[PDB]
Amino acid sequence: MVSSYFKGILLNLGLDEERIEVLENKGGIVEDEFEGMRYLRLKDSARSLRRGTVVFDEHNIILGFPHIKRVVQLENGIRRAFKRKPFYVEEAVDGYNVRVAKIGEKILVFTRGGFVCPFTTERIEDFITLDFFKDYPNMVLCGEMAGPESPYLVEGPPYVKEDIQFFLFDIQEKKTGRSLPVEERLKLAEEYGIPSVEVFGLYDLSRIDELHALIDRLTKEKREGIVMKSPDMKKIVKYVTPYANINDIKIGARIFFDLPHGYFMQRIKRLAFYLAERKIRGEEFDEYARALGKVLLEPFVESIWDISSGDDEIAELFTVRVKKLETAHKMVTHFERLRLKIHIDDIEVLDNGYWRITFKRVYPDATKEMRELWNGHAFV
């Protein structure tokens, strides 16, 4: 299942031979390839090697991006995580996570599971100077790809009016995964002109009222929320706006079936705790309740009416911009490998020479279940 070349590497990293065999047989490690280069991807955790870690050789090991804990009560979340010490407050940008690293003579861009993304790898030169990797070849840039023309999301931050943008939020060492302190990271981003998530400033528990005001502005502006980081990057906590929880439900409700466990419940919970903590009552409360009822039912009922007539499946349309038509071919292949039913719906050339590709992604498992229910399937 997995070559002894990679298993030798895992052994030298101190992993036990028996654990490697178990990971192999269960499919917790898998081999992959990009542009002819073989690498190992960790589908599950293995001692200190986090999920989404990729292994090309003994030196080029890109650690998986860690989970970020969230709180649902902002004031008491801050007191428990940070007490009264200062912490940085950054914008949470609603996109997809990327790790950017120099591998051999190539700059590769990895998404969360450890896949080389062919779109982001082609485009990354539009946002990040290669100079950074001439000077720091063993550092990994971590950030969010976000905007209205995204291959993986149908929403994005409102101030990105077209195409897509990179937003740096961490710099990590190859192999160890260690993060630079906030200040050194921000100094490097300025030195190299790497675009950064907005840094709102340095806060503490005593400034909770200003953070609530910040959350209300981010909400009105359709932005996702904040991420709170101790200066040494060891304590990290995220907190998202009611807009993000409501809009997430709206998007997911078109499909409803086959989503991650708890997708809707977790967001209803986050909304309830926001309303409780902010003591929201009366008409302002009713407006959230009406909005939640609408985003749960309207997209869902619309899809039901859609599938009740015809053979067409539930579908999302999205566009991306590419420099080379061959990149779009490579995204189709990559989408197939991820077991997604996506084809090219439309192509246009833009006045700046870029290709705008319109993709159509269909959802056959959600479609099947929704249709069987409409057609009267009885179930326990």
Q: Does 161 bind Na ion (CB under 5 A)?
A: no
- The residue written with tokens 């195409």 in the block is 163
Residue 143: CA count within 13 A, CB half-sphere: 25
Q: What string marks each residue from 310 to 339 as x (binds Mg ion by CB under 5 A) or -?
A: x-x---------------------------
Residue whose C-alpha is closest to residue 299's, from 314, 318, 285: 314
2, 46, 189, 197: residue in contact with ligand ATP (rule CB under 6 A): 197
Contact positions vs a copy of itself (CB under 8 A): 67-73, 75-81, 237, 256, 264-265, 268-269, 271-273, 275-276, 285-286, 288-294, 296-298, 300-301, 304-305, 308, 373-380
Start-to-end C-alpha separation, the chain: 39
Interaction between residue 92 and ligand ATP (CB under 6 A): yes
Question: Any contact of residue 318 with Na ion (CB under 5 A)?
Answer: yes
**Measured between alpha carbons, how far is residue 369 from residues 217, 251, 256, 311, 361 in Å?**
40, 18, 10, 14, 17
191 binds, among a copy of itself, Mg ion, ligand ATP, none (CB under 5 to 8 A by kind): none
The residues with which 347 forms a beta bridge, in sequence order, are 357
Q: Which does 248 bind (CB under 5 to 8 A by kind): Mg ion, Na ion, ligand ATP, none?
A: Mg ion
String marking each residue 81-100 x if it binds Mg ion according to CB under 5 A: -------------x------
Helix residue ranges per DSSP H, 99-181: 118-123, 131-135
Which of residues 310 and 379 has its CB atom nearest to a copy of itself in the complex?
379
Q: Tell me, what amino acid is at 220? A: K
The distance of closest approach from Cβ of residue 57 to ligand ATP in the complex, given in angstroms and rounded to an integer, is 26
Residue 65 in the binding site for ligand ATP (CB under 6 A): yes
Using the minimum distance from each CB to ligand ATP, give the nearer residue, 93 or 116: 93
* Length, in residues, of the chain: 380
Q: Which of residues 219-278 bind ligand ATP (CB under 6 A)?
A: 227, 238
Tell me the three-class secondary structure of 179-210, residue by residue.
Answer: ECCHHHHHHHHHHHCCCECCEEEEECHHHHHH
**Out of a copy of itself, Mg ion, Na ion, none, which partner does residue 77 contact, by CB within 5 to 8 A per kind?**
a copy of itself
- R_g (Cα) of the chain, nearest Å: 22
Q: In what order do the strands lie in the sheet with 37-42?
A: 29-34, 37-42, 54-55, 61-62
Span near Mg ion by CB under 5 A; candidates 260-268, 281-289, 298-306, 320-328: 298-306
Q: Which residues 95-134 are close enough to bind ligand ATP by CB under 6 A?
A: 97
Contacts of 331-337 with CB under 8 Å at 24 or more apart are 331/118, 331/119, 331/151, 331/357, 331/359, 333/118, 334/115, 334/117, 334/118, 335/359, 335/361
Pick what 310 binds: Na ion, a copy of itself, Mg ion, none; C-beta below 5 to 8 Å, kind-dependent: Mg ion
50 near ligand ATP (CB under 6 A): no
Match 């079936």 to its residue by tokens.
257
- Nearer to Mg ion by C-beta: 122 or 224? 224
Shortest CB 36 distance to ligand ATP, Å: 28
Supply the DSSP string of 283-300, one letter for each residue.
Answer: HHHHHHHHHHHHHHHHHH
Q: Compute the distance between CA of residue 4 and CA of residue 56 in angstroms, rounded to an integer.
A: 13
Smaller CB separation from ligand ATP, 67 or 281? 67
169 interacts with, out of ligand ATP, a copy of itself, Mg ion, none, CB within 5 to 8 A per kind: ligand ATP
Largest CA distance in the chain: 65
Binding site for Na ion (CB under 5 A): 67, 148, 318, 349
Give contact residues for ligand ATP (rule: CB under 6 A). Answer: 65, 67-68, 90, 92-93, 97, 144, 169, 197, 227, 238
